């Protein structure tokens, strides 16, 4: 069970002076998404790569998915998968319409629902309840990544919590609960002139997975003053 | 391992004042969302007030303006300043923490409590 | 404010029964609403948290339900050592209340 933030760990909006554009286009409506496909290359030993296409926008034909370590790429390469997760391009390297990303994979025999679950998200604001809403899966098991992008996605559109220039928020974090053990997520970027997407993202290569019946979300905000 | 231990309670005049502690161990304490609930000699349970993690502060009507949550982070130390007491306000005072996070509307750790008499 | 009523506010139950305790909210409070067990010369325990989700350590038995303004505890096969005041919560917005209680005492 991971330490709660310790005191002046968060993140806070107000000392990020680059463009919040950054972070927001993580969590805004394109990610990659695939159902039972199999790896088809690797460049390094701790990564998978994946034929998956958008044929929609054109951005890139391979998703190159990165993990923490060689047990894991090992564990999948030759599985069929489903592939959920948060993509970035700048420094994605695979040695040109490529793309990367960490972790969200599944192994797809054996995990699939008949029907889809509802998870409940918890939002909170500065103490209070501020609203919830659902995230719906059809996996028994399922990455924090993928259940982290749809809470932050609602939360985007709905409540802006990342906007071209700014947030309206001060710090954030978003909390799993599963039995007796949690985890959290810092949803804010780094101090500084620069958010460095691919770093950011690399929390995700544990391909920390829940599963979808027991696990419970609870968003804590904080307005700035 | 959660730990709160109330102090302070104690005989007061109609209209005087008091000052609560309550000092915790085992969690980071700003973390979570403290609040103090009283129950009063009918055994009702009351809402008095409530501080965020960020350090926002809430109070029922029947108290604002008269009581005062505060914190000091580094002391793990939670305060309630009581002014203009008044009979209302005799009741054991527990201070309570969250069960997860930065909500204060819920109240999954208590202390053992603390007995403030408003009387001459 | 949000009036939470607890009624019957004293019950008399047998070891072994399924008890069900009532509370209802005078406004909908969703799904914000918790549930507490307080024993003689004890602080109150969390029971159940957003009326019907189960908390690590509270014994198995303890369970809830409803949604909007009216809710149910129930304690499956209710036991001597259940004999307390069970008290429900407005934790959906201020002031947070409580409902006055219900008293519960076993049957031998």
């Known amino acids: 069970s991971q330490p709660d933030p310790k005191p002046d760990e968060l993140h806070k909006s107000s000392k990020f002076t680059g463009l919040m554009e950054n972070m927001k286009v993580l969590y805004d409506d394109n990610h990659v998404s695939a159902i039972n496909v199999k790896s088809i290359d690797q460049f390094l030993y701790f990564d998978l790569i994946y034929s998956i296409k958008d044929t929609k926008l054109g951005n890139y034909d391979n998703v190159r998915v990165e993990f923490k370590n060689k047990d894991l790429a090992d564990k999948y390469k030759d599985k069929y998968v489903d592939v959920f997760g948060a993509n970035y391009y700048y420094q994605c390297y695979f040695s040109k319409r490529k793309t990367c990303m960490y972790g969200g994979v599944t192994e797809h025999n054996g995990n699939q629902l008949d029907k889809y679950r509802s998870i409940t998200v918890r939002v909170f604001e500065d103490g209070k309840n501020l609203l919830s809403f659902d995230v719906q899966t059809n996996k028994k098991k399922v990455t924090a990544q993928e259940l982290d992008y749809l809470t932050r996605h609602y939360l985007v559109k709905n409540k802006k919590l990342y906007e071209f220039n700014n947030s309206p928020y001060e710090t954030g974090y978003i909390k799993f609960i599963e039995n007796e053990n949690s985890f959290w997520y810092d949803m804010m970027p780094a101090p500084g002139d620069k958010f460095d997407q691919s770093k950011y993202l690399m929390m995700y290569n544990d391909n920390k997975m829940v599963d979808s019946k027991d696990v419970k979300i609870e968003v804590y905000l904080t307005t700035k003053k | 391992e959660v730990n709160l231990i109330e102090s302070g309670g104690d005989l007061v005049k109609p209209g005087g004042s008091l000052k609560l502690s309550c000092a915790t161990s085992?969690?980071?304490?700003?973390?979570?969302?403290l609040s103090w609930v009283r129950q009063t000699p009918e055994r009702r349970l009351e809402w008095v007030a409530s501080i965020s993690g960020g350090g926002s502060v809430y109070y029922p009507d029947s108290v604002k303006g008269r009581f005062t949550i505060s914190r000091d982070t580094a002391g793990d130390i939670l305060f309630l300043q009581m002014n203009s007491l008044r009979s209302e306000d005799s009741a054991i005072y527990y201070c309570?923490?969250?069960?997860?996070?930065?909500?204060?509307?819920?109240?999954?750790?208590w202390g053992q409590g603390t007995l403030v008499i408003v009387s001459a | 404010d949000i009036v939470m009523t607890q009624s019957p506010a004293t019950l008399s139950v047998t070891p072994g029964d399924r008890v069900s305790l009532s509370c209802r909210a005078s406004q909908s409070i969703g799904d914000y609403l918790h549930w507490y067990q307080q024993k003689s010369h004890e602080s109150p325990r969390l029971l159940i948290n957003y009326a019907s989700q189960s908390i690590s350590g509270i014994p198995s038995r303890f369970s809830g339900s409803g949604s909007g303004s009216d809710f149910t505890l129930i304690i499956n096969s209710v036991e001597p050592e259940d004999v307390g005041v069970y008290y429900c919560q407005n934790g959906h917005s201020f002031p947070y209340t409580f409902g006055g209680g219900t008293k519960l005492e076993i049957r031998r």
């Open positions: 309570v923490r969250d069960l997860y996070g930065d909500y204060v509307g819920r109240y999954a750790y």
């Open positions: 085992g969690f980071t304490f700003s973390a979570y969302g």
